[PDB]
From a paper:
The replisome that replicates the eukaryotic genome consists of at least three engines: the [name]-MCM-GINS ([name]) helicase that separates duplex DNA at the replication fork and two DNA polymerases, one on each strand, that replicate the unwound DNA. Here, we determined a series of cryo-electron microscopy structures of a yeast replisome comprising [name], leading-strand polymerase Polε and three accessory factors on a forked DNA. In these structures, Polε engages or disengages with the motor domains of the [name] by occupying two alternative positions, which closely correlate with the rotational movement of the single-stranded DNA around the MCM pore. During this process, the polymerase remains stably coupled to the helicase using [name] as a hinge.
To test this hypothesis, we performed a rigorous 3D classification focused on the C tier of the MCM ring of all replisome particles. This analysis identified six conformational states of the replisome, referred to as States I-VI, which vary in both Polε stability (Conformers I-IV) and the location of leading-strand DNA lining the MCM pore. State II (4.23 Å), which accounts for 22.5% of the total particles, is almost identical to State I, except that the leading-strand DNA is released from [name]. In Conformer I (equivalent to States I and II) with a stable Polε, the MCM ring adopts a compact inter-CTD interface of [name]:5. In particular, a stable attachment of the leading-strand DNA to the CTD interface of [name]:5 is crucial for modulating the MCM ring into a conformation competent for Polε to dock.
Residue numbers in the entry:
A (entry chain 6): 257 to 419, 434 to 463, 499 to 509
B (entry chain 5): 20 to 106, 130 to 200, 205 to 213, 234 to 305, 319 to 517
C (entry chain 2): 180 to 710, 738 to 868
D (entry chain 3): 163 to 324
Amino acid sequence: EQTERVFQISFFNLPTVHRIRDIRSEKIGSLLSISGTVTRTSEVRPELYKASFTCDMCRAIVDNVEQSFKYTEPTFCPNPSCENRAFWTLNVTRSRFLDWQKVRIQENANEIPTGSMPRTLDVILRGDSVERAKPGDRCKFTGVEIVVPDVTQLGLPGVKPSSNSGVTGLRSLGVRDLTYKISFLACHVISIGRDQEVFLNSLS
Amino acid sequence: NDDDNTEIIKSFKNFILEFRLDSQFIYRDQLRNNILVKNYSLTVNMEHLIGYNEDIYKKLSDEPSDIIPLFETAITQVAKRISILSRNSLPTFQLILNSNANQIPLRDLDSEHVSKIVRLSGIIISTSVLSSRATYLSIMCRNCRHTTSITINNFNSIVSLPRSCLSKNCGPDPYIIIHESSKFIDQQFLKLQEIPELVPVGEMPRNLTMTCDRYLTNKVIPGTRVTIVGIYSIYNSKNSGVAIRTPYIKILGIQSDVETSSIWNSVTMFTEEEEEEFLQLSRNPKLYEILTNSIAPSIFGNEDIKKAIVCLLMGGSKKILPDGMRLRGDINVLLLGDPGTAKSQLLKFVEKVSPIAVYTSGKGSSAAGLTASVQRDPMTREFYLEGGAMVLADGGVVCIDEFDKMRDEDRVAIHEAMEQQTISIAKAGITTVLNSRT
Amino acid sequence: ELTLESLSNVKANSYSEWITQPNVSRTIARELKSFLLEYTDETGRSVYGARIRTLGEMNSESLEVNYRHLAESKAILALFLAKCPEEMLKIFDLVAMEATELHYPDYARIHSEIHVRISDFPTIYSLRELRESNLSSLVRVTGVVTRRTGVFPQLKYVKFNCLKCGSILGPFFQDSNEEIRISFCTNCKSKGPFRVNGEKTVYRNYQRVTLQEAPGTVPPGRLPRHREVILLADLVDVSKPGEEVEVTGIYKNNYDGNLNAKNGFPVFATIIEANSIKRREGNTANEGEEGLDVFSWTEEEEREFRKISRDRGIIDKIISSMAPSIYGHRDIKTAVACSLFGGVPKNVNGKHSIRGDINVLLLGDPGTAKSQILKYVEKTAHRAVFATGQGASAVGLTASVRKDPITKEWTLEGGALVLADKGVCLIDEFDKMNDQDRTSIHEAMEQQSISISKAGIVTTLQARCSIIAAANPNGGRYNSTLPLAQNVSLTEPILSRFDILCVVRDLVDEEADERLATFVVDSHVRSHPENLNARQRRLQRQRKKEEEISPIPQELLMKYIHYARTKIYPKLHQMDMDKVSRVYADLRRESISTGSFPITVRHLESILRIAESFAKMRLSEFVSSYDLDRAIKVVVDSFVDAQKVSVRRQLRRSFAIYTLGH
Amino acid sequence: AHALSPRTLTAQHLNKLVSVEGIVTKTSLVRPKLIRSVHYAAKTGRFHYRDYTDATTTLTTRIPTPAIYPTEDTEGNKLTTEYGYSTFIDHQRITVQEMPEMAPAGQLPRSIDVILDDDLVDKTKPGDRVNVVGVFKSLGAGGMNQSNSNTLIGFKTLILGN
DNA sequence: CACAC
DNA sequence: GTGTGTTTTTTTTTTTTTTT
Ligand SMILES: Nc1ncnc2c1ncn2[C@@H]1O[C@H](COP(=O)(O)OP(=O)(O)OP(O)(O)=S)[C@@H](O)[C@H]1O
Ligand SMILES: Nc1ncnc2c1ncn2[C@@H]1O[C@H](COP(=O)(O)OP(=O)(O)O)[C@@H](O)[C@H]1O
Ligand SMILES: [Mg+2]
Ligand SMILES: [Mg+2]
Ligand SMILES: [Zn+2]
Ligand SMILES: [Zn+2]
Ligand SMILES: [Zn+2]
């Protein structure tokens, strides 16, 4: 029952702590320590991490398929006898999954200028960092500021693109444009807002 | 398949032409009489078919949806043989079945029984308007103008336009309906509710959709208790799991007890024997006492109350003057007194005995739910009126228990209708004055 | 030829692939056959052989196999089941079908297949603690039913027919999670439209229930989570909407484009395939019990019920065991037992219907364990629904209509009395809610029906409830010198429905105080948490503590109550109408003359109802003379205690001629 | 027997001229529609007309026209749509329901859709009692298009008022 | 339906 | 050349329900 151990590196205690107002897209692909008040949290769902597909004929197994924001699947069968460019059956048992949650944070009350609406943001939590930031608790997140394109424009087997500057011209796009949305991906979060023998052992 | 179809058709034709109990060809005579009054239908009793030949009944019960159209074709051929001198344009007849099989409870209908014959009971709660299903369909080829005809069985298997020209390619959809030459029949959608005495404990009643056809359309009205013998069929509605299928019933027989739409279509559906029995009963000098004793026998005493109930159930005679205003013929009776005097029992008995009767609770009653409710159509986004409780009792009686628990804004809404026998609604752009002679 | 130890040391990398090995499959089949035929408990009988007997007899098609039994003997089978249930469900179902064939030859006619409902799963979860590691494995989550679709027939063996060339496709097994995919046709590689064959196709029942995190287990101030469970054939329509239940099943997942589009990640949506169900609504204080049905009684249990029924004095022992933790108040205990067993609802020719449920009202000073009595009743009865004071509105008691958020139409959902149908409804602080809410239950407690005529929805529900209410006398204290109506705020019609009315007075008597305080302290010491493995040792300690106070075990008393309610229909053939008629006439005579208690025909029917309950609690199918005299004495005593003390002595003197013998 | 009411208008009267009495309840907005488009070719000085037919316009069934103005002649000549010379007709769609007073006990009034065209538009308003004489025509596909093979939806039925 | 992907 | 994809809507107005 060998189980490939994936690891989740948790960075914390960065020299600087930004905020929603301090968000700048030029910091994409970098580590920050955003602190904000949690207002809304999603559920704990399993998200595909390392896909493991099987081609419909000749049964060749494609494993360790990297997954982007889309539902990407392998496009070529490694066995040069299988005609498969879009037809596969994902081996649900063999594929790797991650516990995943989408939390919603907003600007802290003290950081709000008078009259201005407090600004919100969406953060992605994975692994043990899930369910550690309940709504109402101001938490000091930390991780990477990423951007999610609109996967509807990217093209999906089940959905279609739906209808202020969008870029276009990709091979996979064709004629439609692509829009982007800033999000955070946290590797660590901290909120900043029984037998006798058990108590003795848990006591210094 | 054609040979088997011909075999079954000929067997059914022989059954029709030969079946008889004692010197009277019952089905031949019934078919002739139905043709005489332009009633192109036939009520076939199940025990008769079973007794004639068990093999035919087994073949019918195995795949009714395919056997029945052949039976209808045989009926049409028999009608042509024994109602028109050889050497047309006669519509295909509609089959009606009557059985005595065990009535399966409505909630007992399950993944099995699909495409079988099912007998059950219920109460009608909704009767949609009559739509039209095509039987003869004249069709025209789009490019090469090759006109043909299609015959539709209306028995869905589990049909579309042909996907080829059939005699240049003309496209994969080369056919258009010729409306002025096609033939159509009426179809009605009913919604049945399971019997309240048969619901599970702590369970809301289960609804079920079904479809009438032709001579079975407009046979009953909502609020009536009926029994249906039909086919438990399946259709896929595109409106939330995977491979889910909507169940329903295709009707093949109705057995009501409160007659057809209206009060026997506002006319006498009374056979001669029962009419003569009614006349004989009317000549009884002690008929008043017999009726009084027949009102709530389990309730001791209360003779004057029983006589007043008899008067109410009879009611006066409606008068319509030439000048325009009318005089109602209903009686309004209130029963006050100490609790535990079987007043609620009397109202329940009245609701039980009255041909048209709606029993309502005082607290569980709203003005919009008693006469008419303005509701927005989910699909068409349009407002429409849905009849209230007292409207369903039109031409009958409403037994309102806990009359002291009328909401003062709800009690007043009945003042017009209990006297004028009319309901005026001016809501959501709808201005109507319906009749409620209750 | 593989051993159980050979099952223990896995060879294939994944457990499911290990199970797919044919020799492993045959070995597991034979081992499960042996486990079914030979599993023996402490009493020595083979449980599963009798289970197959019952499965055949009632044609249940479902074999409820406890997880604990399979864990204790041949444990690696239970470990595999908790890890890879998907294939062994099929294999164990086939083995159960073969065993049924052994007991019941050619059982395949009645049921082609058999299912298995695994019970008592150890790892209980919640809709907040689920993680991806639980995929393709059994869980025992707990939740409240929120939505429940209809019983849809669903494709089992789809046999498509090719449109281009072919005419038959293989009977693919519909997963019931994702739509069946055909891809390139087998007859020809070209792709085209497909549709099923109506000749050879079979269907299974399908229901789409939605469990939500229970309000009890949700941390306060936090939103509750929800997950969806599919009920397959033979499992549909088992839990009503709004019911709190425990579901054991597989935690599967599938892909949908909508979720990926909404969240922007290749995330799947989880889903639960039901395997067994236990309703836990109304028995949240009944933990420590085994089996999916607590009120379920075995054949030996029914035999024990019959044996103890023939015992004389069983009525008194049952009465004393109503409130073992509550000292004294024997009349209240008797009334509670009568309402619990209840009478037979008469229905004359389908025209006249007679209520067969007993409604009891307890008026008494605070701190008299009336609330504790109601809590015991809620924990005790088969179907119990508890509501308190203003915390229950008029519509929430019986029924309410609402516009459907998804389909946009009015639909009716039952209230408290609907969920308590053919059960019991308890009303704490019956004097403290709104009178307009209190009047909404007249039809419910007398006609045993709920009529709704609102928003174009007109119907008549049925609520065969047994109303038990608790109130507080005016000013918080009961003035015995005054008539009962003056000590209450309620009217006659609400007083009339209640068959039995018990008045509790808080006096100061040194002997009574001594005994009550001693009993309470003894119970509290007995109730102290600090007061051959751990399980049966704990059970023995609990039985030791119970036998001090309970003449009959409560876990057996509740089964006996359920059995008597569902299988005893006593008849009143052996009785004397003269005594009952005279008693009713005298009751009305003393009520009209210097009296305020309403004595109506409902009250006369109450005597027969209480006699029927007395016959029920002895499992008697005919109301004996003792069952009638006891009911008459109870009724006359309840009437007398409802009168002022000034005329109470004279009324008791008049009534003494009717309670002869006791 | 052709003097009927919306309740009694059974399917047997399709393609038959009937007279129905009722109350006007809903009236759609007056909307003109094309029946004939006129185009001018500014390379030959010629006028080309194209007649447009619809199931709701002509009684006899004909191939529906895609309602596209031909901007080019057959001989590669650009055509300009000549409004004013093209032909449009006023169209309306009203709802006629039976009398509430002859509505049978326990039933609400039923309604049918009528298509007034050309002169008949705006000749009636909601709340008016009326008797219309016209053809009981049927429209729609009623499924039968592989979109609804087993689904039991019927056909669109209405009256072309004369 | 039909023009654009 | 075979087969798609739109256009495509949740307002205002009733009715109910809990608080107020
Ligand atoms: N004269 C009578 N004969 C027979 N049964 C009677 C008589 N009077 C009362 N009853 C019984 O007493 C009970 C009365 O219950 P209900 O009819 O529901 O209440 P009610 O008499 O209408 O008065 P309410 O509704 O409380 S104001 C029923 O069980 C009747 O059978
Ligand atoms: N007869 C009794 N025997 C044992 N305990 C009692 C008795 N009467 C009252 N109590 C105790 O009093 C406490 C409170 O009673 P409570 O349910 O508030 O009475 P009430 O419902 O009349 O207000 C309970 O914990 C119960 O144990
Ligand atoms: Mg009553
Ligand atoms: Mg209390
Ligand atoms: Zn391959
Ligand atoms: Zn052609
Ligand atoms: Zn093929």
